Amino acid sequence: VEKRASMLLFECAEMRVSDLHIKVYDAEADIYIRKDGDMELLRQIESNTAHSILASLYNNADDSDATYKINAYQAARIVASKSRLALPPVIQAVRLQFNPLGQGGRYLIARFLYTDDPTRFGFHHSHAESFSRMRNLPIGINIISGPTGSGKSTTLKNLLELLYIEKKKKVNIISIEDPPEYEIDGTAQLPITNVETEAQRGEEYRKAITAALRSDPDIIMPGEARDAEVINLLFTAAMTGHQVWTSLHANNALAIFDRLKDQGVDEFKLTDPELITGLVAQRLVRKLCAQCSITLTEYIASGGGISDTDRKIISGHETSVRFPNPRAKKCCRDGYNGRTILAEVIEPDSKLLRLVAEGKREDAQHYWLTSLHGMALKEHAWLKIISGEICVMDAVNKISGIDNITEERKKYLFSRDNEI
Amino acid sequence: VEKRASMLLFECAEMRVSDLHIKVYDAEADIYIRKDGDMELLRQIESNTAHSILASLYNNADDSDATYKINAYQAARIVASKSRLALPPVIQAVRLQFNPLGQGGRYLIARFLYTDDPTRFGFHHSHAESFSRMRNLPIGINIISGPTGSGKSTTLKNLLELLYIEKKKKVNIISIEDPPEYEIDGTAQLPITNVETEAQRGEEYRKAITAALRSDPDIIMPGEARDAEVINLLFTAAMTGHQVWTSLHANNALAIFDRLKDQGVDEFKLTDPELITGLVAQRLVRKLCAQCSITLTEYIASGGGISDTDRKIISGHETSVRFPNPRAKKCCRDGYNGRTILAEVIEPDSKLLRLVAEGKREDAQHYWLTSLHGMALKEHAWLKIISGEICVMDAVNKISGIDNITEERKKYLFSRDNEI
Ligand SMILES: Nc1ncnc2c1ncn2[C@@H]1O[C@H](COP(=O)(O)OP(=O)(O)O)[C@@H](O)[C@H]1O
Ligand SMILES: Nc1ncnc2c1ncn2[C@@H]1O[C@H](COP(=O)(O)OP(=O)(O)O)[C@@H](O)[C@H]1O
Ligand SMILES: [Mg+2]
Ligand SMILES: [Mg+2]
Ligand SMILES: [Zn+2]
Ligand SMILES: [Zn+2]
């Protein structure tokens, strides 16, 4: 049934969910949507209809042949206005993955791609100053780290839009992205055209990187650093006299070096402070509605209670924190509004990189937090909890270790933010 | 349309731009030129005409077959008086790169090659004395480092012209260059003739290097050190009893060793101070017009303002600095005249190389700046800012870290230059 798939994709585009999960059991099938990170239950339908939608989704993709069969792992992709019937204009590509599930069941996951105040998107002012400092530098490599849900592409787009204006259009910027999802002024995104099979995608990505290096690159923005060859090419370009802005998957701002050593980057490449200009780690959390703004007493009287760690976090400022209001008001659909970025930005020095390269993780963290006046993800999350922008539960679900901050550090951060 | 291409190349030769960029969108195409490093907007035309010029440029190259197709990365080269119709005599070769850009768009970059007081080309007198000292030495390897825009080939040409006169024509000099772009007296440039495909160019370069080594080389000037095999051959020739002058791509004068270790040079080759005779890092900046010479007060009254870091740099000498005059006077076309070299020259010792090999970057830099009386790029840029030759904005765009110089170092440099 193509009509059911059309309405399902229309609903997914209208509510702007990220990924769509369909689990088909022997009796009934469940539909889940990943909207703003959290997963919600959309609908529950019969198994035969869901099997029909899954077959229609697989048959309409660009992976024709290797027909739809149960108990098989199958990957596919649907391109808008290119793959048979048309798609909503907000969606460019849908990546489909089919997994077996039990006996007589299926598991489909569709990852949608969307076409889609400039100074701060929830950043701290220290992060903005650090961003300006790294934008002023003409030579170096910058790595943006975080999960797939965080706003890395938007951050890079905004940084390059600011940098193009700041340079008075006297510099050339070249970006390499396999999907040209975000339009950036004066950047000339280079797509990957002859992708062919999935195994040949990396070779064409390397070819695009080398072609961009044979150009006048100056500033380079690859979409993602995935394998060792692309990272080696980027590090070679960084020691040549080019500026590189890249995205990486990592758990921490200081854990970027672990990923680079996993890929194969040598120690003398990571030792230079002039090369590795900046490291950014990002997470996205939900912003509480500023109009409802119920307090801790109202949340306790309504129902529910906080745990011991949440109480320990709250204990510094009781009345300053706010909690979500599930009253279904007209101002907020669910009370969670949009989303904010919690981030940490590090500008390395010689001593910090020497401490990192020697394996002294605790010493390097102490040097960054004390001598360099740094701020981690947990401290920014605690500050946003105290300010009342976000809830404690979402922060402790996204970031761990908020309760481990000492009282002296909390007082120092509060005094530093109140003085400025 | 071949006529439009002919006038475009005539304009590019007449204004002597370095590279030419053409970006073709769905509606209109933009033409950019890289003149004196900065990029300027030449013209805006329609998409069909620009596509016609791009097709005519690709078809007239030496890469016939593999016809001009959209969404494909294509490399080509045009040789003057050899590739079908003739070219201006000032241009030898034009390297063409074609990249996809969006849907129904293209991106062409053409890199022109040109045919093209002897003691200083903007150098400091310490750099001239160091150059004389390295020219007097009969055995060693010298590496010139910098970006592709800096004047490395001209510096090597001038150094070899001075050295041939200083040696009273009692020595043999052999140079290896793939383009024989610069004519040097008594040097006998060896070109690469049977280049065939682009992948076979390195093998013929190695063959030319080995043929030059089978000659009486004495002093050798390869065009560029690109791969590990050529660098290994040059290091083998340096330990044999030959003098090597080479060009390398690097970010810093002391960062040459990082590139050499990346290529595969062992530690005992880099430890010897008698082998690595000198290291030079070069940048090119724009020279302010000496006739207009407006001050800081005139620049402030005309419009615009300097930032906090620029004010911190200026604060030592307010009236000594000068700013560009955009009055469109008859003496200067744009107020930026020609270009000057900001460079750093290091003559290594045993202790400095031992500190570099042990990974002590800060200790090696301190030893070079204090014990060896060295001068970095930032200090030379600051001295040229104070003298009034160049503007602070161009220097801070080209070189970072000018504001990090301490007041004691600034006073020491000013007193040292005023005493001599
Ligand atoms: N303040 C915000 N900052 C970043 N992203 C936001 C923000 N608010 C909403 N979003 C949404 O987060 C989503 C994910 O960001 P994205 O640019 O796609 O990064 P990534 O490529 O790593 O997934 C975006 O679609 C964006 O619309
Ligand atoms: N004082 C100067 N020193 C060096 N180059 C200069 C100077 N003034 C103008 N130029 C120009 O800089 C351009 C680049 O120098 P070049 O010899 O080509 O080095 P490279 O081979 O690394 O590009 C030259 O074409 C030269 O005409
Ligand atoms: Mg992304
Ligand atoms: Mg050269
Ligand atoms: Zn509300
Ligand atoms: Zn003038």
Numbering used by the authors:
A (entry chain A), B (entry chain B): 107 to 222, 231 to 534
Text lifted from the article:
T4P are composed of thousands of copies of a major pilin protein arranged in a helical array. They are assembled and retracted by a complex machine composed of several essential proteins, including a dedicated extension ATPase, most often called PilB, that is essential for pilus biogenesis. Here, we report the cryo-electron microscopy (cryo-EM) structure of the BfpD ATPase from enteropathogenic Escherichia coli (EPEC) in the presence of either ADP or a mixture of ADP and AMP-PNP.
Purified BfpD was prepared under two nucleotide conditions: either in the presence of ADP (BfpD-ADP data set) or in the presence of ADP, ATP, and the nonhydrolysable ATP analog, AMP-PNP (termed BfpD-ANP data set) at a ratio of 2:4:5. After confirming structural integrity of the sample, cryo-EM and high-throughput data collection yielded 7,207 good movies and 313,223 good particles for BfpD-ADP. Additionally, in the BfpD-ADP map, Mg2+ is seen between Ser267 (from the Walker A motif) and the beta-phosphate of ADP. The loop (294-310) carrying the catalytic Glu295 has a well-defined cryo-EM density and is positioned closer to the nucleotide in BfpD-ADP compared to BfpD-ANP, assisted by a hydrogen bond between ADP and Tyr296. Comparison of the BfpD-ADP and BfpD-ANP structures reveals a subtle outward shift in position of the N2D with respect to the CTD such that the mobile innermost N2D loops delineate a circle of 65 Å in diameter (distance between diagonally located Ala172 residues) in the presence of ADP, and 70–73 Å diameter in the presence of ANP class 1 and 2, respectively. Transition from BfpD-ADP to BfpD-ANP resulted in a slight outward shift of the top part of the toroid, a tendency more pronounced in BfpD-ANP class 2. Top and side view: As a result of N2D twisting in each of the six subunits, the BfpD ring contracts during the transition from ANP class-2 to ADP and vice versa. The ring closure represents an event of ATP-bound BfpD, progressing to the post-ATP hydrolysis state (ADP).
